[PDB]
Amino acid sequence: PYTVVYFPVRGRCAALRMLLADQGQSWKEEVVTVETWQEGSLKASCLYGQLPKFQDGDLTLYQSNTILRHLGRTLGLYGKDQQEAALVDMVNDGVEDLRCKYISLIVTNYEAGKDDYVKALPGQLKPFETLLSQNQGGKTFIVGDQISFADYNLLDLLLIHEVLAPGCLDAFPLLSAYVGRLSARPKLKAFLASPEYVNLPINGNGKQ
Amino acid sequence: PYTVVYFPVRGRCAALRMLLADQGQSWKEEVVTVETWQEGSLKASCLYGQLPKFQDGDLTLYQSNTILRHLGRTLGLYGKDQQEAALVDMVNDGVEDLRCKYISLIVTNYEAGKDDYVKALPGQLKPFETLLSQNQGGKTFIVGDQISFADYNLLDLLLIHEVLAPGCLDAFPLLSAYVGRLSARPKLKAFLASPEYVNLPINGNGKQ
Ligand SMILES: [Ca+2]
Ligand SMILES: [Ca+2]
Ligand SMILES: [Cl-]
Ligand SMILES: [Cl-]
C-alpha cells in the first residue's frame, strides 16, 4: 500500500524510511533517474514540481514533512495528547529549518561555506539538547516517552551532521546518547546496516 | 487562554490572528520593539531565537506553523479525517515554501529581484488553483468542506501577493473567488477591516 518515489538518494526520504522500517511496515521504492527527471514530464505532474512523491493506496502526497505527519498520525507516532502533538510539531519544524540550511550548503556552497557552517552548528544543535534535558533528563525521546515522527527526522539530521562535521555532538551528551540509543532499536539497527540504506549516498551531488 | 508575542507587523502572525478572529477566539497581543529584540535577552529565551512565541494556558509554542497546526488540531480545523489532514498539511507546507521565497525577496533582494519574482509567480500560484479545481469545483475550501488552518495561511499569502503584484490572481478564477468569499466571512471581514490589522505594516522593513 506504500510507495516512495524519489531520486537514488537518502536525502529527504531517509527519516520516513527509518520510521517505516522501525515500525515493521513494508513499502515499495520507485527510483527516478536524473535523465527521467530532466525529460520533464514526471516533474510537470508533481504538485509543486518536486520529489518525494508518496502513495498510500490512492492517496498521493508531496512534501517530505507531510509524509512524516501522515505516517505519524496513522501509526500513532504523534504524542499522547494534543499538547504533546504540538511539541512534536515544534521539534519537526525546528529540524526542517536546520535541514534547509544543510541542503543549501550541500547544493550551493559546499567548498566555500562549510567552514562557516560547522562553526554556526553548535548554536543550531543546542535547542534540541535543551529539549532533551527538559524531557526526563534526555533518557527517552525528544517528546514524551513514546517515539514520534520528529524523532526519526531529528535522528537523521544528527546522523548526517556527524558525517559532515565528525564529533559535532561531543558538545552535546544527551544528543550523543540519543543517537546511539535510537540507532540500537532492533528493526532500525538492522535497516541502518542494510545495503538498501548503506549503498545510497546522502545527497545527489556526492557531497557530504 | 491565548497570548501572541511578536513584532508590530502582520508578517508570520497574520494567518493565525485571522484564524483566531474568524473562529471567535480571544487573545492578548504582547508587542516586541526593535530595541527590546536587539537588547537580546528575549531572543536568548526563544527556543530557536525567533518570534512568534505563543502561549496557550501553560503551553508555550514557537514556530508559526506549529501554532497554526495547534489551533487547527484543538479547534477542529484540520479536515474530516486522516486523508484530509494529510492534504491540509500538503497545502500548508506549499504555502510555507512560497512564503519563504516572498520573505527572501522582501528582506534581501527586493529592488533587483522583484521583476523575476513576479514573472515566476503564476507558476508558484498554479498549484493552489489546481487544488481548488479538484475540490468541489473550488466552491468550498482548499481541502474538504470545512475551513482548515491551511485556508487562513493560504488567504494571507494570497492577500500579500496582490499587494506585491496587483492583478496576480486575475488569470486564476478559483483563487480569485476563494479570496473574495473567505474575506467576506463576517468575523474575518470585521478583523481585516480593523485598525489592529489595517494599521500594521505587512513586513518589518516597510517593503511590500
Ligand atoms: Ca505511540
Ligand atoms: Ca471544523
Ligand atoms: Cl521555519
Ligand atoms: Cl518545503
From Swiss-Prot, chains A, B:
CDD domains attached to this UniProt entry: GST_C_Pi, GST_N_Pi
One Gene Ontology CC term in the entry: cytosol
Reported effect, A112V: In allele GSTP1*C
Pfam families: GST_C_3 (PF14497), GST_N (PF02798)
Outcome of substituting Y6F: Reduces catalytic activity about 50-fold
Key word RNA-binding present: no
Keywords: Acetylation, Cytoplasm, Lipid metabolism, Mitochondrion, Nucleus, Phosphoprotein, Transferase
Modified residues (N6-acetyllysine): K126
GO BP terms: animal organ regeneration; cellular response to cell-matrix adhesion; cellular response to epidermal growth factor stimulus; cellular response to glucocorticoid stimulus; cellular response to insulin stimulus; cellular response to lipopolysaccharide; central nervous system development; common myeloid progenitor cell proliferation
GST N-terminal domain span: 1-79
Chief localisation class: cytoplasm
Gene3D superfamilies noted in UniProt: 1.20.1050.10, Glutaredoxin (3.40.30.10)
Molecular function in Gene Ontology: dinitrosyl-iron complex binding; fatty acid binding; glutathione peroxidase activity; glutathione transferase activity; JUN kinase binding; nitric oxide binding; protein serine/threonine kinase inhibitor activity; S-nitrosoglutathione binding
Stretches of the chain forming a coiled coil according to its record: none
InterPro entries: Glutathione-S-Trfase_C-like, Glutathione-S-Trfase_C_sf, Glutathione_S-Trfase, Glutathione_S-Trfase_N, GST_C, GST_pi, GST_superfamily, Thioredoxin-like_sf
Family: Belongs to the GST superfamily. Pi family.
Protein's name in the database: Glutathione S-transferase P
Organism: Homo sapiens
